[PDB]
Amino acid sequence: KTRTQQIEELQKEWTQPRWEGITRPYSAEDVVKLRGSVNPECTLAQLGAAKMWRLLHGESKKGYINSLGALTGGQALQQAKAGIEAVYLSGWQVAADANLAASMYPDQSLYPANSVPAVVERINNTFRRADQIQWSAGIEPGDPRYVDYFLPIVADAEAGFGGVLNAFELMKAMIEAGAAAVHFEDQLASVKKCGHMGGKVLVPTQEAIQKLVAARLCADVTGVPTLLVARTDADAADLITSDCDPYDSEFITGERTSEGFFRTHAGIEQAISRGLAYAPYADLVWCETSTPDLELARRFAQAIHAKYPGKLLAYNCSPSFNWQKNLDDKTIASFQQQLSDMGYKFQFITLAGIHSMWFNMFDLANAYAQGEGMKHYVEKVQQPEFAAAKDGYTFVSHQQEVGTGYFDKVTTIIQG
Amino acid sequence: KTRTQQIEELQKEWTQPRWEGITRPYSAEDVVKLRGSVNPECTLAQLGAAKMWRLLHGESKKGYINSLGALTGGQALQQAKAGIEAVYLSGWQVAADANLAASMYPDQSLYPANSVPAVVERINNTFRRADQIQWSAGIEPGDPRYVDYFLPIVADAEAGFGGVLNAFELMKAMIEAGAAAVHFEDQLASVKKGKVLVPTQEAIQKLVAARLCADVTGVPTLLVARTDADAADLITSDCDPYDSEFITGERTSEGFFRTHAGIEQAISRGLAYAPYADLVWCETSTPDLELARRFAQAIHAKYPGKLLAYNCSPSFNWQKNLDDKTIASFQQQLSDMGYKFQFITLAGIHSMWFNMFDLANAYAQGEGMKHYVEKVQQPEFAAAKDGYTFVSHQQEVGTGYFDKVTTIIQG
Amino acid sequence: KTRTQQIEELQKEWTQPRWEGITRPYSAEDVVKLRGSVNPECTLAQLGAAKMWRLLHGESKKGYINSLGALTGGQALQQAKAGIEAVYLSGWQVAADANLAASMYPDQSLYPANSVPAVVERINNTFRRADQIQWSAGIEPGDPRYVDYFLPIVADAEAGFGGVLNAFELMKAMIEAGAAAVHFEDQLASVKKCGKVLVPTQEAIQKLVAARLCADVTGVPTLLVARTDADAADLITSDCDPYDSEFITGERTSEGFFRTHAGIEQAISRGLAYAPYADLVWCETSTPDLELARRFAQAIHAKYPGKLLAYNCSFQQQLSDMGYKFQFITLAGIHSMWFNMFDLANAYAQGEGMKHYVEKVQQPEFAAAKDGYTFVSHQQEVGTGYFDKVTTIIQG
Amino acid sequence: KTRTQQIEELQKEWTQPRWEGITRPYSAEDVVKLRGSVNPECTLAQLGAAKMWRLLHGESKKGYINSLGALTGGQALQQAKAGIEAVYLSGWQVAADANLAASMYPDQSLYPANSVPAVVERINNTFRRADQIQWSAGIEPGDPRYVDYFLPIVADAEAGFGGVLNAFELMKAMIEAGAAAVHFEDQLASVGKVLVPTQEAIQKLVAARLCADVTGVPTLLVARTDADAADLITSDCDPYDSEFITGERTSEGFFRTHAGIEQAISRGLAYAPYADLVWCETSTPDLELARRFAQAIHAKYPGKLLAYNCSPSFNWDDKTIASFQQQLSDMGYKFQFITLAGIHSMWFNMFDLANAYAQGEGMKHYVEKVQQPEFAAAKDGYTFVSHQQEVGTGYFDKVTTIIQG
Ligand SMILES: [Hg+2]
Ligand SMILES: [Hg+2]
Ligand SMILES: [Hg+2]
Ligand SMILES: [Hg+2]
Ligand SMILES: [Hg+2]
Ligand SMILES: [Hg+2]
Ligand SMILES: [Hg+2]
Ligand SMILES: [Hg+2]
Ligand SMILES: [Hg+2]
Ligand SMILES: [Hg+2]
Ligand SMILES: [Hg+2]
Ligand SMILES: [Hg+2]
Ligand SMILES: [Hg+2]
Ligand SMILES: [Hg+2]
Ligand SMILES: [Hg+2]
Ligand SMILES: [Hg+2]
Ligand SMILES: [Hg+2]
Ligand SMILES: [Hg+2]
Ligand SMILES: [Hg+2]
Ligand SMILES: [Hg+2]
Ligand SMILES: [Hg+2]
Ligand SMILES: [Mg+2]
Ligand SMILES: [Mg+2]
Ligand SMILES: [Mg+2]
Ligand SMILES: [Mg+2]
Structure with missing residues (x-):
């Protein structure tokens, strides 16, 4: 395909409904100049992104996609057999028991940057084998027992493992492995403050935006409409690395820490301001939460939607708490349905796969080790x-x- | 430490009780010429072998070690916390969900040969983290809340992935990663159509190559000789006269020779591998007590006290029969036969896959x-x-x- | 695309000139049933195969392709810049300094079976980069300074590391990584006793078939090179194949192997048996010998005229005239690397650095x-x- | 061994000559609490660190160690047979042709962080093999043909790939693979070059020293400064840098500083007490420039080991070209190396060979x-x-x- 032909095809594609409300600070010619003369096809990434987009726009079974963190190809396989419609790939789970350094780590971006894409590939390979088994048995699409094994995979890209070029390379690896969506966050886990009323540290809004632009550019170069999930940790982070961005001045307190960090007024207002800033650059907005508060969810949703109506939102839980300690059983039961009516179409339990796995091994082992194995x-x-x-x-x-x-x-x- | 002193040490080590009844067809001098001037320490492999030996000779809580196949460092960690004394690392589970080709495969040796060792390292690395956490908190050996995380690891080396040098290199990878024990089988899975055995002398050479590697590294790793002869009615060749009583003379189109599958063949292989291995294992598909008693009696008529290993997959609805009473005492009856190392090979993958299915089937329906x-x-x-x-x-x-x-x- | 539709596209493609003279013991239907509902595209493998074929059928600069073994993507880069038309990837080189076990090994299929495909991937990644650099700077295809960096990669799959399924998986790895051609041999390197040992003819044929089936399943027309080591191997693992009976003396070794009559006659019967299942036939040799080369070629062409041959290395032009269109020095990259490192370092260590x-x-x-x-x-x-x-x- | 014995041995060891002039902001008890009850031996790391120390203190052949960047175990092997006494492992070469992402990259910390340690392992394995061959052929230490294949490996950890914990884990992987020495820098390639506040750079040097101490291996730590050509700094949180901070901030929020040998010297002096060697990266080979730095370093720390590099991106009189490394040695530059020697040697020669070969008469x-x-x-x-x-x-x-x- 000629260069000029590629430029024209992109310009036309950005007018399609898939890109409605999305901002790109670069041109089609900018994109096409980074491609090279041969651009390898990424079949699974293409399929996953298309499927995910449809599930988020009326094709999900329940009106919303509810997922569970998975750390092995086999866990994802059982999810597909059980009826799950998208796989959630947690960085935390990867750090603890499935990374390329072969070590158990806490969630602080300590593993090699290519670890999540490695797990994405494992999951897709498992899916391919299942599909092959099924196809070779003659069970074809639209059969009383035909399971569609290719579930879109949503993967955790943390903060990109460095600068914009690091986020660009990680995005590329996610796509080549077949991920359908990727999430980037605005906290710098590598410098979490120790001691003294410390915790997560945010980066200036502008820096977080350049990472989303870096991921969108890589996606556009490869030519796959990968879904971009912009996450903000501003609800709980009351530290920022710098005051270079005027957009954050209203949350900056003036106080400085010994590391040079600037304190900020943490809370839903800061989360809302990050949410609004990332919205035009992402397909989904996620405001990290630590408690199951339906009222806070509504407030956050209403704020984003007052400016960007219909904007897709994601909602998580680890969960780190005892839901039954915080809520009554009826609210626990209808929790996901209520969220959906507020606009949270992508919901997930980040550490379900690791809790599922580790608890059940313990339970079996504990009884087995005593006798009557x-x-x-x-x-x-x-x-x-x-x-x-x-x-x-x-x-x-x-x-x-x-x-x-x-x-x-x-x-x-x-x-x- | 020089060559002569190294030679001298080996010779003396081989007179220690650890090596009783064990045959080595080579010399201490052969061992030392393969070492090099510098031989890196394998601390985890050393500790795991010594511990595994002690557990098999009186230090295990129940008199026998019962294990469950694990495929992630985390599954192993939970086993350590639950009181398990040794970790079993199954090649089937690795092929299915934890190998270096990142693919799902059936159990036919399709994954890259360095995959099991990679899992061994993961497990030991998980244990190192747990131990550090415990130690940093001030909890030391002796302390009643102390948990000993370094469980010996028993790993699956299949048939070595090639010839004797392949097996030699695999044993080496296993030891450097910290495995305490390693098993080798006499079937040739690269041709499972039923199962196919290799000649008795070929199997023995693989066991020899493994023992040689361990002696070169200087670690007393346990060697588990497994035979698949109870279900294999084909042999690759008739070159070994030891196998002639089971060879009918008939040859198939592939050039393989038909044999008679059964405990008789299993017994013959077990007896031949005995002098070369620390443990003997006859792979089974049917957890059957009479069959197990027959195998152990045979081996023990010739090598009294020889340590045996017993597994089960296990097959679907196997319990479908034995009364609940036989099911509950199953492992104790086996232990009295001499099976001191018992294990459920696919426990981890069944545990993991089923529970994920169970959680997800309910969650996908609503009221998540x-x-x-x-x-x-x-x-x-x-x-x-x-x-x-x-x-x-x-x-x-x-x-x-x-x-x-x-x-x-x-x- | 529908199953039946896929089956028809396959039947038709097998009638095209690309497949004249190639035998396939299976049906299109068999191929299609193993694919799955989704078959990922393998862009680089497709391009590499199409290009290697064209170069072998009239588009090379000299009527023949001469390659040099490379063990790093950078080495391949320099070759592309110097004018080479195809990259040769040596398993021997991989075993010595570029395998996934991170160890130095003799050439006995000791390394992890996914090691060669990993280097194939590195080479293709280096090429993608060079291409991106060139494209981003404006130099487009057809430019008087535009270098075509995508050189077809010829890679060594040794004996496929085990049985037919391992060869199948190895072929899949080669293709996914972007190899254009792959070679399989009939010796069993993991058993070189303290010379070479061949496997029955039918066994070597089963591996060529497994390899071709995987390529057919992936839909990529990858070139398959059948290599025979029978010119120097006087040992065989078994006498199960009737086709080999005339070379088998009856003598048997302590390992149970059968002695055979090695020489060009043994190489010719293997060459002939593999011809219909391979795109290229290669009888491995150690010393340049035009008369020997002429004999092997005449013997193959008497039954398979036009059959392309590969030659393990006016010398080159006559070979080319005889049919040896793909010529190469397998260990050039490692000799080039280690020698020059030694040269430079030897002098440097002394002084005047x-x-x-x-x-x-x-x-x-x-x-x-x-x-x-x-x-x-x-x-x-x-x-x-x-x-x-x-x-x-x-x-x- | 008891917790108490461990703390005691650790303290006595810190009074040894190996550690004079070196500062540790933490105690022996801190070290031991991070160890665990089982601490696996790191044989190759122990041997290489001891050997590198001895070479730098009189046992080298020429009074100084001159190395060449190697990117494959095979290249290192040939260096050992050639008489080289230490192997230099460049991150630049790793980025371009030997990283775990299997891609060619510019030198901006884009490859997976465990990439260099993977190459250290390859090199040590090749050395093990060469040593086994020799020993198995009856050749032993003292035999006129015996070659000592275990050259100490100097490895590039760049800036640690993140915060102090990334630096800690990186160091851990370098030591387990068997490196003898590791270098860390104060620029942020991830971000001309931008420097980090002096206290941050120092925190990484402490993170690395701490891991080594926990492992129980006396690894050599080389503190590198890029301040000779860095005119930017990420922050003004460190008063120690205040004098170089101009006041003019950039659009990224970075601050301008006064780049020059004067900046390098202050970083150089600030890292000295925490490193075993100090290295002020350089682009152009100026002896006078190199003399001022050396002398300046030695005013406060007499006989401090210095390292000097050459890309050489350059294009080097013949008499000075020939005595060059002899002169630096006299200034106190005991560890000298040509970082990209390895990749130019390999890539050029394949070009040279293929070029001729492609024409005809191959x-x-x-x-x-x-x-x-x-x-x-x-x-x-x-x-x-x-x-x-x-x-x-x-x-x-x-x-x-x-x-x-
Ligand atoms: Hg792709
Ligand atoms: Hg602190
Ligand atoms: Hg990209
Ligand atoms: Hg800013
Ligand atoms: Hg929120
Ligand atoms: Hg949740
Ligand atoms: Hg070791
Ligand atoms: Hg060994
Ligand atoms: Hg035999
Ligand atoms: Hg049995
Ligand atoms: Hg069992
Ligand atoms: Hg592909
Ligand atoms: Hg295939
Ligand atoms: Hg046969
Ligand atoms: Hg020949
Ligand atoms: Hg030649
Ligand atoms: Hg170590
Ligand atoms: Hg450490
Ligand atoms: Hg500061
Ligand atoms: Hg300098
Ligand atoms: Hg230099
Ligand atoms: Mg995360
Ligand atoms: Mg197994
Ligand atoms: Mg080869
Ligand atoms: Mg560097």
Whole structure:
């Protein structure tokens, strides 16, 4: 395709409804000059981004997408079998038990920058195998047992691991691996303040914006309409690294710490001002929260929507607290539905996969180690599995689940 | 430390009780010429082997070690916290969800040969973090709240991924990562159509190559010889006269020779591998007591006290029969037969995959937070009384430890 | 695309000239059932295959492709700049200084099976960068200074590291990483007893088939090179294949291997058996011998006229006339690297340090500039200017 | 070993000559509390650190150590056979052709942080193999042909890839892989170059020293300053920098400073008490410029080890070109190195070879450019002529032999 042809096709694409309300501080010619003469296709990223966009605009089963953090390809596989519509890939879970340094870390961006994309690839590879198994058995799209295994993957890009070029390279790796959406945040975890009423440190609004622009540019160069999730940690961060951006002057207290940080007035107002600033550069806005407060959620949503009506929002929980300690059972039950009616169409439990995994190993192990080992394995795992069969669980047939049937057909064809 | 002194040491070490009944077809001098002038220490491998040996000879709580396959450092950590004494690292689980090709594979040796070792390192790194957290908090060995995190790791080396040098290099990767014990099998999974065995002498050479690597590194790693002869009715060649009684003479189109699958063949291989390994294992698909008693009696008629290992996948609805009473005492009856190391190979993957399915099937339907509270958070809070500490997730992964490191540096 | 539709597109493509004379023991239907509902695009593999084919059928500059083994993306970069048309990726070099076990090994298939594909990926990434630098600076295709950086990569899959499924997975890795051609051999390197050991003919054929099936499943027309080590191997693992009976003496070794009559006659029967399943046939050799080369070629062409051959290295022109259209020195990259490092360091260690660096490297680099060598400007070569543009665009 | 014994041994060790002039803002008890009850041995790191220290204190052949940037284990191997006493591992070379993202990058800390440590491991493994070959052939320390393959490795940690914890973890990976020395800098390539406040740069040097102490290995720490060409600084939080801070702030919010040898010297003097070596990065080779820095450093810290580099992006009179490294040695620059020697050697020669080869009469140029010169060099110690042996074919043949009885 000629350069001029590529420029014209982009200019036209940015007029499409997918890009309504999105701001780009660069031109189509800027994008096309960074591509090179050959631009490799990223099939899974293309499919994931398209699918995610549709689910967020009327095709989800419940009107909203609710996800659970997953740290292995196999956890994501079971989610797809259970009916989950999008996979959430948590950086925290990766730091603790699935990173490339092969170490257990706390959530402070200590792992090698290419660790999340590595997990994205594992998940997509698992999805491909399942799809192959299914296709080779002749079960085709639109069959009474046809499971669509390619769930869009939402991945945690932390703060980009450095400057704008670092965020640019990480975005590229996420896309090449097949992620459907990526989230960037405005706190600098690498410099969290120690001691004295310390905590998370924000970067100036402008710096956080350049990272979103860096991720959008990389996406545009590759030609995939990847969803960009702008996250703000300003609700709880009362420290900023600098006062260079006039937009933040109203939250700057004047006091300075020994590191050179400037104190700010933390709270929903600062969160709202970050939310509004990132809105035109992202497809989804997320305001990090630590408590299940429906009223605060409404307020945050109303504020963003007064300026950007219909803007898509995301809502999380780790969860770090005891929901039952904070709320009554009926509110716990209708929590996600209420959020959805406020505009939170993407909701998730960030650490569900690790809590699920670690707790169940502990539970089985604890009984097993005391004796009567096989009875515990039978009562805690096998019996529950047989009962789950009715619901779509097929791992009871463990050889087939991992491709044994698929590879047998390969073998038979080769020696055919 | 010089060559002669190294030679002298080895010779003396081999007269120690650890090596009783063990045959090595080479010399101490052969071992030392393969070492180099500098031989890096393997602290974790050393500690795990010595501990694993002690547990198998009287220091285990129940008289036997019962394990569960783990595929993440975190699963292992929870086992350590629950009182498990050794970690079993299954090749099947790695092929399915934790290998270096980042792909889901069936159990046919398709993943890159350095994958199990990578998981060993992950596990030991998880244990190193837990131990540091504990130590930083002032809790030391002897202290009643001290938890010994360095559980010996038993790893799956399949058939070595090639010839003797491949097996030699794999053993080496295993030891440098810190495995305490390693198992090698006599089937050739790269051709599973049923299972296919290699000649008895070929299997023995792989065991020899593994033992040689360990002696070169200088670590007493435990070697587990596994035989798949109970289910293998094919052999690659008739070159070994030891195998002639099971070879009928019939050859298949692939050039393989038919044999007679059964405990008789299993017994023959077990007897041949015995003098070369610390433990002997006859892989089974059916957890069957009479079969197990028959195998152990056979081995023990010839090598009294030989330590055995027993596994189960286990197969679907296997308990479908044995009465509940046989199911509950199953592991104790085995221990009395000599099976001191028992393990459920796919426990970890079943545990993980099923629970994710269970949580997600309910959550995808609605009332999402209720299901999370009822299936996870509530049960977690109730297990805190038993030693589960992940209820406080930030402390578990080292936030407190690293915050302290930051503090020492800043001030 | 529909299953049936996919099946039809496959039947039709197998009638095209690209596949004349190639045998496939399976059906299109078989191929399609293994694909899945989604088959990711492999852009670089497609381009590499299409280009390697065209170069072998009239578009090379000299009527033949001569390559040099490369072990780093940078080495490949310099080759592209100097005018080479195809990159040769040696497994021996990978085993010695570029494998995923991070160790130095002899050539005995000791390294992790995904190691070669990892280097294929590095080379392709280096090429993408050079291309981006050139494109971002305006130089477009057809420019009097435009260098086509996407050189087809020929990579060594050894014996596929195990059975038919491992070869299948290895081929998949090669293709996903962007290889244009891959070679499989009939010796079992993991068993070189204290010479070479061949596997029955049917076994080597099963691997060629597995390799071709994966390429067909991916939809990429990757070139498959069948290599035979039978010219020097006098040992075989088994006598199960009737086709090999005439070379088998009956003598058997302590390992249970059968002695065979090695020589060109053994190489010719393997060459002939593999011909229909491969795009190129290669009978590995150690010394340049035109008469031997002429004999192997006449024997293959008597049954498969036109069959392209590969030649492990006016010498070159006659070979080319005989059909040896792909010629290469497998270990050039490592000899080039280690020798020059030794040269430079030997002198440097003695004294007059900067003088030796200037005469052995700087001066010569300067003279090189006139021939298309651009690394004298190393900040630019590595993309400092490309990322400068990225930065500039993001910040305004 | 007891917590108490550990603290005690640690204290006595800090009074040893290895540590004179070095400041540690933390106590022995702090170190031991971060260790864990089991502390795995780091054999290669111990050997390389001890050896590097000895070389720098009289045991080198020429009075100074001159190195060349290497990016593959094989390149290091040839340096060992060539007489080089220390291996230099450049981050620039790693960015361009040997990083874990498998991509070619400019030198702006864009590659995965565990990339350099991965190359350290490759180099040490190659050395292990070369040593095994030798030992298995009966050759031992003292044999007229015995080569000491374990050269200390000097490795580039750039700026630690983040905050103090990233720097801590990076150092941990360098030591576990077996590096003998590591360099950290005060610029922010992630951001001409921008410097960080002096206290921050120092915090990274302490983070690295702390990890080494916890591991129990006396690793060498090289403090590098980029202040000779840096006119920007991220903040004015450190009074120690106040005199170079002009007052004019940039649009990014960075502050302008007065760049020059005077800036480098103050960074140089501020890092001295925390590093084992001090290095003031340089673009142009000026002896006088190098003399002022050295003298200036020594006024306050007599006999402080200094390091000096050459890209050389340059284009170097012949007499001064030939005595250059001899003169620096006299100023106190005991560790000298050509950072990109490795990549230019490799890339240029492949260009030279391929260029000739592509034209025609290929076999001819290969023989003339590589093979003939290799035979000629065998005389001087080059052994790759016998390539099967160099990589261990003979060592693995012995293994096979012992195994099959
Ligand atoms: Hg892509
Ligand atoms: Hg603090
Ligand atoms: Hg990009
Ligand atoms: Hg600013
Ligand atoms: Hg919020
Ligand atoms: Hg939530
Ligand atoms: Hg070790
Ligand atoms: Hg070893
Ligand atoms: Hg035999
Ligand atoms: Hg059995
Ligand atoms: Hg069992
Ligand atoms: Hg692909
Ligand atoms: Hg394939
Ligand atoms: Hg056969
Ligand atoms: Hg030949
Ligand atoms: Hg040649
Ligand atoms: Hg270590
Ligand atoms: Hg450390
Ligand atoms: Hg400061
Ligand atoms: Hg300087
Ligand atoms: Hg220099
Ligand atoms: Mg996160
Ligand atoms: Mg297994
Ligand atoms: Mg090869
Ligand atoms: Mg550097």
